[PDB]
Amino acid sequence: PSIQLPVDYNNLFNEITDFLVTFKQGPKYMAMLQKVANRELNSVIIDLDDILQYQNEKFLQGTQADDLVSAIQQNANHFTELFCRAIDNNMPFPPNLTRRYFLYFKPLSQNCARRYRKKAISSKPLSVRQIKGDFLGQLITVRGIITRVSDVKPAVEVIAYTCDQCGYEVFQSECTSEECSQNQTKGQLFMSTRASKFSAFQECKIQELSQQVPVGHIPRSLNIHVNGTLVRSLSPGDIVDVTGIFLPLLTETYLEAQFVRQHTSDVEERVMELITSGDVYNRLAKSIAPEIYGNLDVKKALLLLLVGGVDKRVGDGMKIRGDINVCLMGDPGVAKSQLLKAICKISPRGVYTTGKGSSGVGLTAAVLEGGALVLADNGICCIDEFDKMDESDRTAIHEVMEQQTNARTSILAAANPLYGRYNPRLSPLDNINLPAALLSRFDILFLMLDIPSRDDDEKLAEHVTYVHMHNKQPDLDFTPVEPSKMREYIAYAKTKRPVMSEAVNDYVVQAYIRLRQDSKREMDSKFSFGQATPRTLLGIIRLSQALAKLRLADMVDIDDVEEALRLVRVSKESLYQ
Amino acid sequence: DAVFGDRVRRFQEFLDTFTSYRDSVRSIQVYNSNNANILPHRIIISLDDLREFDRSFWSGILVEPAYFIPPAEKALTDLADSMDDVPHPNASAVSSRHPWKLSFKGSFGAHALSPRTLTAQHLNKLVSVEGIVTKTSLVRPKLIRSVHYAAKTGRFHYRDYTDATTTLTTRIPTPAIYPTEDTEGNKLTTEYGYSTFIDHQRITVQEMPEMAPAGQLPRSIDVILDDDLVDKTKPGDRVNVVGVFKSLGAGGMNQSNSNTLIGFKTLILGNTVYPLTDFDIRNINKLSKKKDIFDILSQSLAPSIYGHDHIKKAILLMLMGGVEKNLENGSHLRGDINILMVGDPSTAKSQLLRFVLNTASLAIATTGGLTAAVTTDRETGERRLEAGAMVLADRGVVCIDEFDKMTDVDRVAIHEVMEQQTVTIAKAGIHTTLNARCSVIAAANPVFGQYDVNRDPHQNIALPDSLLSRFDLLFVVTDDINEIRDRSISEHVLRTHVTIPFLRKYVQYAKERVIPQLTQEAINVIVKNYTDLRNDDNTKKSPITARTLETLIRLATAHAKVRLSKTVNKVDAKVAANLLRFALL
Ligand SMILES: [Zn+2]
């Protein structure tokens, strides 16, 4: 049954031809078609902002105008052919069966719509969950992350046949050409694959991000189809804004992609304020979780671990890691896991984990879906109850602790004593499940002993009870640095690269030799965590690099080495309480 | 037919004889004009009002929906399409063409059923069914009206469609796809921007276990939802749904197909979804001012248990809970309290847990999918996560029986639940964090059945110390026999051979309004008692750690909620210190 709508394609097509002829860069699109006419380009990109600009230009000139962009917005399926029809007759067997070029539309920009006092609803970065059935056949922009891309597959648009009886080229078993239809004898058809119209096609899927998900729901996905020269513009894991035609008594839906895109003095002034305040080395350490008791020397290790060391690809493929590994042993109930939460929260690439790997797939990868260690690549992994991990769980840990594969991570481990409560009279290896093979890979191995002492517990109890009473630590005289600024300075520090001088070079070997020779007595006494090995020499080097890079220093100084030596010696003091 | 038009006018009369219906439609029309989100084109019809206006028409909806509802749908659509001129330049061509749907309320008469009570006698009737949403199907748009342009003739065209589900009456099916050529035979220009589509979803409703008799499989029924109802529910929700119970297909009537096992498929065309004082408040606050209200409330709790005053007090404190805090560094402080019970299996543990589970408003029973990190698939293959008791009990309480029987996978997951009040889900392709702010009460038994009172549960039950340290309060009960005393409690058993409804308001109001903060009075008490406990090297139920200090603050805050004081006092810390000593001895 016939009906009437206000849409008039006659005005729009004339406007399209006029827009092609008139809209300048001479004309922008005529120059583009000239390049295609010169056989230099294979695809044509139509800019809706250019169309909207012309509409406003016509609107400001007072001439006739129709909302061509909205017409293309509502019915992009047919307007794609109309632009091809305009180009097929204006560019400097039925034509559609032989066309080898491709055409796409790029979306309106929100700045342009606001500048022309209009609303660009289609180009709004909506999620796939918000795309109702009203958007079928409408060019819309979708914001999300690609989760799966298929390989290139043939996509025949028109199938070509040749006939023996007439020699005509038949396009789509028996020849339907005029000669064979008249003749009593018809030549049987065969597939002329070299003459069939192949189109490059790939299958892509987009999915909502976590922040786009409602309460407790699963992020939904939508099908994105890519054709023509646009192929291989999407790869898995890409957070992209894709504009395409959302296309379909129940109807399944998919989208044909048309446009693809991916997703300092301002902070230096805050850095200047930090430099103005001074005490950068200790202020950052003091700012690390003020609600936690005063483990300043331990939290200093967190500051250097958060900053990290400096990687050194020596050559010939040989590698030296730039990460820092610190362990946090201690009795249960001291709430030490809160620091693990704090550090993971502070780090922008931190991954948190408790005990054994989640369902086993928490480590390594599954049929691949990477685990926690792979997730924290170029980041930090915090583990609570490290000793309870399975052999397979710890086996994957050792490889990452040794090879960083990628699983480039800084490892912060927390573990309760193997007996439930610690025994200082025993060696640390006896009181823990972990052997010396894994502990030797650590840089700093601080131990917490929940020693009942009226003096210390009085301060800690007052410290904690004030944290519950007031939303800030009782040390109100100190103003902590906000995590964003703490993160920014660490990122600012990360850009620097301190280098050793010859003066510190001799100092490092002198301190190493001095400490190594005396550490023989420490191991002979059997009352120390570990013997002095090149773990101490290289450990200080990484720590000195971190301290120098923490100070934003271009070169390493002696005081960093002494401070690094100080912290290492401080860590042994816990065993003697 | 002419009968169809008669009932359309009859419904129009009903929409006019009670202007309270169509004036709300005008309110919808006014609101939609201002937003040039969109309010749904749906109104709820009171069946009692329809009963008193036209008994036959009111009975028509209940008894003969196919011949009465579509006339009513057209009349409501006609009223909405004529009450305004729709001056929108372009929206008048697409948005104004959506018909208006009906909803129903009031007395359902005999049509108030369950999936079990729903039978073949109820087919072709509008009925209300009560049940639970087991699962939901995937949402897809469904074509309703097609709009196309005949370019050769220079004028647009359109075509409608019918479905066995959307058409209550048996109209001729239209399996034709969106047309390419019309009567003129010219190739049509497709108009997607002006065609009409409506979303559709399928859900499964099962009889509630509360009325299910043993020895039979559960009864379920499918409900069809469209447009506004397409995504209004999630699996596991209690629901009352009103819809047309209608059959489809044929039970082998075509050709021979004379097998005796084949039956007719049935489902419900749902159209209305119902997902499922100051005098007391002033009495709640007034009762708080007497000194013994803490003990009196501690005696109304568990009337079937004699003694166990500290346990009953502990239950009250756990319900009251503490106060959570936030820090400028971005950290958060736990406030809730957990309780653990240990000892001989049948001795009063299942009895105490039964009362708390029945009394608490958001109590969930658990025993050894609680981790909420597993998915369930639909009939078409797509899958969705299912919630877990720890996650569902957010701002509630978890009741655990046979806690000793739970697996190690549960223990590692509950470690973050009891300490960080969150669940960090890390699975293949699924990663999310869910709040688990739930109070925990659990019961456990020794392996031998008889508890060795000389030793801690770490050897009588052998649970990990890290897991056990997460419980703020622990109690051990065993039926040590005093014959004259056991006679007193057994007489009531042999007899078988403050009011709770107001108390639940007392618990609700106190936690709803009172958020106590700490005071200098308790600061000295907390530090001194904690230091004394650290100084006490004698054997105890558990060693003294910072969590004991946290428990004292949580317990003192809970007592302040009992007193309904927004600031703590020295008496609250005194009670908590004494109670913790009892739990540590
Ligand atoms: Zn031929």
Curated annotation (Swiss-Prot), chain A:
Keywords: ATP-binding, Cell cycle, Cytoplasm, DNA replication, DNA-binding, Helicase, Hydrolase, Nucleotide-binding, Nucleus, Phosphoprotein. Its EC number is 3.6.4.12. GO terms for biological process: DNA replication; DNA replication initiation; DNA strand elongation involved in DNA replication; double-strand break repair via break-induced replication; nuclear DNA replication; pre-replicative complex assembly involved in nuclear cell cycle DNA replication; premeiotic DNA replication; silent mating-type cassette heterochromatin formation. InterPro entries: AAA+_ATPase (IPR003593), MCM (IPR031327), MCM7 (IPR008050), MCM_CS (IPR018525), MCM_dom (IPR001208), MCM_lid (IPR041562), MCM_N (IPR027925), MCM_OB (IPR033762). Its main location: cytoplasm. It is found in: Cytoplasm; Nucleus. It catalyses: ATP + H2O = ADP + phosphate + H(+). Acts as a component of the MCM2-7 complex (MCM complex) which is the putative replicative helicase essential for 'once per cell cycle' DNA replication initiation and elongation in eukaryotic cells. Core component of CDC45-MCM-GINS (CMG) helicase, the molecular machine that unwinds template DNA during replication, and around which the replisome is built. Residues 280-465 form the MCM domain. This is DNA replication licensing factor MCM7. The gene is MCM7. GO terms for molecular function: ATP binding; ATP hydrolysis activity; chromatin binding; DNA replication origin binding; MCM complex binding; single-stranded DNA helicase activity. A motif (Arginine finger) lies at residues 440-443. Belongs to the MCM family. PROSITE patterns: MCM_1 (PS00847), MCM_2 (PS50051). ATP 2 binds at R441, R535. It is an enzyme of class 3 (hydrolase).
From Swiss-Prot, chain B:
A motif (Arginine finger) lies at residues 469-472. GO terms for cellular component: chromosome, telomeric region; CMG complex; cytoplasm; DNA replication preinitiation complex; MCM complex; nuclear pre-replicative complex; nuclear replication fork; nucleoplasm. The chain holds residues 18 to 738 of 971 of the full protein. Component of the MCM2-7 complex. The complex forms a toroidal hexameric ring with the proposed subunit order MCM2-MCM6-MCM4-MCM7-MCM3-MCM5; loaded onto DNA, forms a head-head double hexamer. Interacts with CSM1. This is DNA replication licensing factor MCM3. It catalyses: ATP + H2O = ADP + phosphate + H(+). Belongs to the MCM family. It is found in: Nucleus. It comes from Saccharomyces cerevisiae (strain ATCC 204508 / S288c) (Baker's yeast). Its EC number is 3.6.4.12. Disulfide bonds: none annotated.
